[PDB]
Design a protein around this nucleic acid. Structure first.
Lengths: 212, 98, 50, 135, 134, 72
DNA sequence: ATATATATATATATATATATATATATATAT
DNA sequence: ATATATATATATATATATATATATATATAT
DNA sequence: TGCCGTTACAATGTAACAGTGG
DNA sequence: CCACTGTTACATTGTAACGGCA
């Protein structure tokens, strides 16, 4: 009959969109924030009405995607109604390193709580110090001023990732943080045991990762 | 059941259907299959519905360790898990009291 | 967790037992009447031939 | 009693009959007030998965008119359901033109037998002619 | 064309048939998404008392696979409606036990006649046999 | 549940683009005939929908619509 | 190195719903 | 012929939720 | 071919008659 | 007697398959 919700929208989708949690979750998602198991309320909300939200967001030409690790996010399409952006290469370095720390048992004593200094030390341990520094400044040759510049850049990238939900600052401390499973996306190019050059094409075709 | 006669078989099938009606009200397509299974001209429908029931419980498995997709097999694993959780509950309530 | 797992186990048990009860009864019935009808038919066939 | 009465089946039949009658627009309820009738119908709807309570809903709100039609329809449905098992007990529905049916019914009422019996006698006379022709 | 078709009658027939099918659960509309199907069904429901627009509704949202069934249902409805005026043109429906029906259909298929023609011929032969004996 | 007319407005195929442009701060005037008519028709519900975001859907005296963010 | 933008937290005032206690008129036991 | 119990209306003030404004930390960019 | 009459069913609902046992 | 059951003879609506005809 008329004046009846099923005329325009499914009942469960309307119930989900009328829930008190919908607005904060939608604003965060459109901002690019990933959702992990830690946000128990938001994660459960996404799980319960997961299908309604993928079909709703499809209207924006963006896929609400749940990675096998269990974290939801948004991937815009080429015809996205919501703009799209790509992380910096330094952001990739810090995200890969963050995934390593999530999987690294040596730092188990930290119990998941990490400081930016430790992250930088691990980054320089695994990466090429000076050749990575080259991107921070084209004229760097190990100068300690440029060293501090790279430290500051790493801190800034860490803050941006915090904005993306890959990392949480502690309820009182902004100098310490706890990693989230979302960081696993930084390894999507290696989660499959195949040739790297074919997986990169598969991902870029899927829209997962553009090149630089 | 081979010994008994048709009357008792019919009566117990009716009782089983009565139990099912309560046990199936939540589902829509499974309930529809149960309803269709009532036609006497097509006994095979019955079996189909049975399959659906399995085809239902297969998807209700929670995580990988309980993926003994044979539903009758998952019962033992689930009972093991209930017993385990009982011990953890005892420990946890002791901890909460202290 | 205990509540959820107990509910799941009870539902599985009840569904499986009731479905088996509902189906196997009629299956055995149909088998028994099939045997009986075959037995009945043989005698008619034998008399008819002569 | 020739046909076994099954409670959980006849109850479902009765519930389906009530719902069909209501959706056809008939006043299954015994209530003339709109509100009580609507409430009783809503309760009956809730009773979908509990055929056992349908007998009680009948005893509380069923229209007094419907006892005869109810007891007729479920009886016929039971007979048909039990006869449908085997072909030789089934029934076949056919349509006849008015002149043909008039003659056949007059003949049957003359012979005092059912239509199937009259057809049996007729086809048997024809087959007797055929048999005698064959020998 | 033997029976003249009347729009205000056949359109009411079509509306009643579609409402019956929808109430029975049949998918009336071609829209898989539930929202569009419900909207079209509501349009139809509020469309009562209208031939010239129920026809257009059928043309625009009707399920492709139900066209033939609806057409033949309306054919039968028209024929029955026109034949139900006179007694001699009406049709009488009866139920025959399966063996009797099997034998009668065997005869009808053998002789190429219809059930009515076969029974008429047989009754005439029975009367002729009576006269032969009498 | 949800208001029925609000569901109608959100479901309308124009809603995604208009919503993106509003959340981007764009002002919808009389020139955008379809969008302006849609907002005119469904303002009573979009005001509540965007107040759920602690934002105000304002129709200026000139007529154009826009979103004003609150402190929250 | 410092101007500037942004997010968060707290205090403060508004507006509304609601429970409490009292005042007034009527009903009914004494 | 009386006084107490009831129902009604009212103001009081209690609490919540909202919305505003200010201070803060601090992360960016020239 | 697609419409249009026509047949032969199927499924369900009812009235009427005949039986059966309490 | 009375009620409940079994059965027959319809009606009512829907559908698939033939066959005629533009």
């Amino acid at each position: 009959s008329s004046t009846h919700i099923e005329q325009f929208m499914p009942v469960k989708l309307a119930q989900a969109l009328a829930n008190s949690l919908f607005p904060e979750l939608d604003s965060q998602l459109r901002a690019g924030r990933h959702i992990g198991i830690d946000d128990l309320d938001n994660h459960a909300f996404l799980m319960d009405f997961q299908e309604q939200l993928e079909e709703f967001y499809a209207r924006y030409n963006v896929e609400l995607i749940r990675a096998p690790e269990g974290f939801f996010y948004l991937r815009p399409r080429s015809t996205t109604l919501i703009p799209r952006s790509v992380l910096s290469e330094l952001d990739m370095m810090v995200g890969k390193i963050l995934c390593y720390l999530y999987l690294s048992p040596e730092r188990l004593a930290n119990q998941g709580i990490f400081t930016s200094q430790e992250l930088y030390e691990e980054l320089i341990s695994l990466a090429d110090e000076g050749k990575l520094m080259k991107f921070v400044n084209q004229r760097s040759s190990g100068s300690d001023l440029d060293k501090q510049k790279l430290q500051e850049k790493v801190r800034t990238t860490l803050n941006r990732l915090r904005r993306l939900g890959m990392v949480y600052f502690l309820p009182n401390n902004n100098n310490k943080f706890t990693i989230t499973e979302a960081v696993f996306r930084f390894g999507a190019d290696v989660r499959s045991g195949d040739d790297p050059r074919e997986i990169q094409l598969r991902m870029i075709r899927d829209g997962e990762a553009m090149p630089v | 059941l081979a010994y008994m006669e048709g009357g008792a078989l019919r009566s117990m099938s009716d009782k089983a259907l009565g139990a099912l009606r309560l046990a199936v009200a939540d589902n829509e397509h499974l309930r529809d299959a149960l309803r269709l299974s009532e036609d006497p001209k097509r006994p095979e429908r019955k079996v189909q519905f049975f399959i659906a029931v399995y085809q239902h419980l297969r998807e209700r498995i929670r995580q990988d360790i309980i993926r003994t997709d044979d539903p009758v097999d998952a019962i033992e694993q689930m009972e093991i898990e209930l017993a385990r959780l009982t011990e953890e509950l005892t420990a946890r309530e002791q901890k909460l009291a202290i | 967790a205990i509540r959820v797992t107990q509910s799941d186990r009870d539902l599985f048990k009840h569904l499986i037992t009731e479905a088996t009860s509902y189906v196997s009864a009629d299956y055995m019935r149909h088998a028994n009447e099939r045997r009986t009808h075959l037995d009945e038919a043989l005698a008619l066939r034998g008399e008819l031939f002569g | 009693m020739k046909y076994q009465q099954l409670e959980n089946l006849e109850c479902g039949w009765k519930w389906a009959y009530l719902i069909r009658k209501h959706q056809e627009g008939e006043p299954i309820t015994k209530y003339i007030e709109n509100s009580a009738a609507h409430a009783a119908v809503d309760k009956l709807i809730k009773l979908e998965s509990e055929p056992v309570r349908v007998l009680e809903w009948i005893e509380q709100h069923m229209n007094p008119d419907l006892f005869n039609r109810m007891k007729q329809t479920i009886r016929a449905r039971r007979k048909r359901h039990f006869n449908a098992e085997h072909q030789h007990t089934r029934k076949k529905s056919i349509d006849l033109d008015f002149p043909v049916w008039h003659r056949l019914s007059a003949l049957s009422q003359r012979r005092g037998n059912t239509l199937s019996e009259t057809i049996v006698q007729l086809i048997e006379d024809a087959e007797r002619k055929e048999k005698y022709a064959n020998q």
